């Protein structure tokens, strides 16, 4: 019961996936490595069935293929994102440029179009080049700036006269905390045995992530912008934060829950300065920017990209990231769930949570324009059923009704969301899961690589046709 | 403390592999489906992981390299087996001939003598075309015969002018027990919830093997043999049984255990006719031979191939059932104290001395001509989660194989003609019902990618071989 | 006046080239970096002409004609070098065997035997991979040790059923000094304004090249030696060092600066330890051998090969450093006359009985059993704006071989076992923090273009070779 008439007009209906969970061909066309190869190769205890994403779901040889697929479900935009050390296999420039790599996402770009289908570009989802995380700490230096500042450009000049959306950053709390506070993501720091401080290093790297993006914005916009005609944004995660029980001190947890894991963010690229929470409780561990800075952050994007997945009760706590917002989380009220646990046990299904994170970014961050750049549900991956049992997802596609309901609930109450994009396209590699689940609407046989449509693919086909 | 010096000149250090577990391409080539396609596809729950034989590792595509690999490693002879359905489609020839098969096995055969690695093959390991499976129940039907005689005489046309060692079946007991009594394997017939009948079928099964293997080995003799100075075989599999005491009543076991696994296909080879624990057992379940037929089986192969992985000790047993048909209870604890040390699965024990013990046994028994360690190996857990650098050196299989080879030397030191010993298998491949839970190989493969990598016992085998 | 009959009739004549030096591809083939791509990238300052070896002179996609111009000079041999990135373009082996790098060694080792060519092949010549050096520092860590044998296993495994020469180390020496005190070659570390510590770090990294070097050699003599029949040395550079004066100063002196530039290598090697005066004035910064590898490092080679230039007279000398640690000033004159007419650069100085010398010091006190001069030749200045027709005309270089030749021959009919001699280099190539402002080629390379042509040098050389 929602149609594709209760959406404006101009509303983009997509999907996506990310360089290092489908390309494969790791070591293939002169690709340098990244820190995901590094830390899937060399400590595969990390993931969950020890597997990596050295072919992933060979998507880097089957782009044609896919692009097929991508038409055949009505695709309206495709996001992917471009491995950095595809294109510049040590990171710097000096360490060159190269060919066989542009080659690719030319060759990628152009046969989308062909298709009908817009391509939306990411610059970077968590495949730091490895040189860089090796030469100086990655984004623990300064010196991630410039280098992510020249690949930018790069990327802008080479492939900017085609693409009209440009990302910078996906989930860079994702990042910084798996990667600095859990140990969990690469480069696998913070945790119990692992190499950091998850206290002082998730601070540093968020810190360096906003300067880079603001750089790549800026980039941007005064020297592409105009020619180009597109737009870059940053594309942030959050869960929604229920308070628990409606007492003044589970509203404040609500307040600094949302703080710690998007005003993070969204804070300096408003005002030019982070949440009064984090300030006031993380003090001297919390960096400061320059007023040059502070200034120049204020506004500086051009969308807000938004990925929820679901939400969470919040309550107060009875040195780390992890610990630094006084909150305690649970999916539960009075041993009621907050909505149907999925395969995991993280993903709880909360249509209405989407509805009122995006109201909240609205009133608390105005900002412009919104995306929802990423929705979507986990799905066991079940060895031992039939493709023909696997296809039907009947359970994937109430799923994306009921978050398109919350959607368009929101357009209807005045938050200018442009779009959604499902996530992902294909089954693909899960990170530290491996390949123990599932998300995409497209099915693939994790060692054949064959590709078969799901029933939400279909779904999905008759929904954009509308 | 085993050297190349204690074997014979002639003796053959070689490795092999077999189609279904090692080439892919399942559906390229225009190979026709078979019975553990049909199995791992339709039932991926009787797989440990749901695997299946698809890509295998992707050997029909990668052959080259792994010729390169035989003899980086100094194989004098690679056994490898064809796909029934990959020559023949629809196993019958009617069907057609596929011509891509024939060029892959031509292009195979080559490449080997290319690299001066010897050539030997088997007509069936288990994958047998669906096709015929489907229009008579395959080896459930006397029809069987006539088609793997013409398959038989097509490769020995085809191919038989630069082989010279031909194996019929591959493990027909294996083929017959865990296809048609557990329903473990393809075609998954016998077993609780299973379509066959476990006190039945097993006989039929291997009855018509014997019938076929038979047809085959005429067909070379009279036919090829002269002309291309090969000879041809079968391969059978047997564990060690050792009595646990030294009672009566388990000595009359063990005989009774190497009856039903072993004398199963020795015995009508040697005097036409079944053991007689098993005739007076099985009664009318076991089908009689013709006069004709019984006479024709007598000394019916050029060789036999023997596979060995492990020995158990046996003892007097306290549904109608193969399994039970011998009144034999096996274990392998004595007094809480195993056989020898207990591998990966559970079931594979390492008894070294088993060998030597089943190949006097095999001599004195059926006083066979010529014999073969056609498969000597050990399984090792594929541990995913540890890196290569460390699952590269399996010190303990190449102390398997030292200890297994000794006792070969000393079974042909003691007068029983072995000429030759087999690694199996050469490469990691796909597992049959444990899919890709474990590892064979002294090639490392990987596999998702098919990248190949020896092993430190490759690199024993190839000092060895050449010393 | 020397000619081919004056040397035993199995001596080795060749000539070598380096991977870094001359394959270019750089980041073709999926080849990982060095820390010689790094270093010329990342520093281009710090070489002459702000050169890099990005595309060197082309050899890897070049060596079909290369081949066919060694076999016009008539090379016995040709020595050359394995860019380790290049096969593993992680170092380790976790991050994975490349294949592309892997089939053009292959066929660079085909194509050289076809020819009549034998391979002999050097694992360690400079470019260590970039991802070992960020890791662990490179040569700094004893993680080295592991990796380096992985490594070696790897090329012996895959390589060695065809080759019967190999190297494991080029000039630790220039590598250890230029590279940690200097601060002249990657990794850039200890001179002024660089980041090491030249005290410290030059012996920290030869003691790991010692350790690597000694399981990479009982790697191949444990495992692979007997089946591929071939031998591993390592590769030592000395100047020959003269006294200055008569007075027992400077034959102390001299026994310092040979005790410091080889003895560092070549007494670990003879008694596991290292020279006397080494110990005795480095002290605490020299570590310490293990009771073990001592012991296994007495005589754990199969040859020492012998790298030689030039040589200096040698005085009692007048920031701690590896350089002023030997307390021995070094100069080429004598009372305003040089050593030997100075060549281009202002530091090679042609002295052929310095290599007579040297060879014999190196039999009296390392009593080394098999040698060979495995790099010898000339600079000379790469002069822009004059023609091919007058660049070609080496008469010096020729002149220089000669000499030298026959200092070889003075030493072999005085005892020391010489057992061959190789010209460096083959062609004109990349050299090193010189970028291309020199050749030493016996084959002219235009820098740019990559045209190769004949040198007279290389004419005298095939007529010498085929006397």
Known sequence: VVHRRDFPQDFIFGAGGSAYQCE????????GPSIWDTFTQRSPAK????SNGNQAINCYHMYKEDIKIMKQTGLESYRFSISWSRVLPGGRLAAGVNKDGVKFYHDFIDELLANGIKPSVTLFHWDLPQALEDEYGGFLSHRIVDDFCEYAEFCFWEFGDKIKYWTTFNEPHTFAVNGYALGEFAPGRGGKGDEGD???EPYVVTHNILLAHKAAVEEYRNKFQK???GEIGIVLNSMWMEPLSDVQADIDAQKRALDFMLGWFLEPLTTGDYPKSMRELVKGRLPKFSADDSEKLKGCYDFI???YYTATYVTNAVLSYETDDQVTKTFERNQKPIGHALYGGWQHVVPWGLYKLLVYTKETYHVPVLYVTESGMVEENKTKILLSEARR????TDYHQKHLASVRDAIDDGVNVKGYFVWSFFDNFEWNLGYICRYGIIHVDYKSFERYPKESAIWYKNFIAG
């Open 24 to 31: 494969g061909a790791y070591n293939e066309g002169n690709r």
């Open 305 to 307: 990209g938004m990925n």
């Open 227 to 229: 020619c180009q005609e």
């Open 47 to 50: 993931i969950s069935d020890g």
């Open 198 to 200: 998850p206290a002082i």
């Open 393 to 396: 997802d009947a359970e994937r």
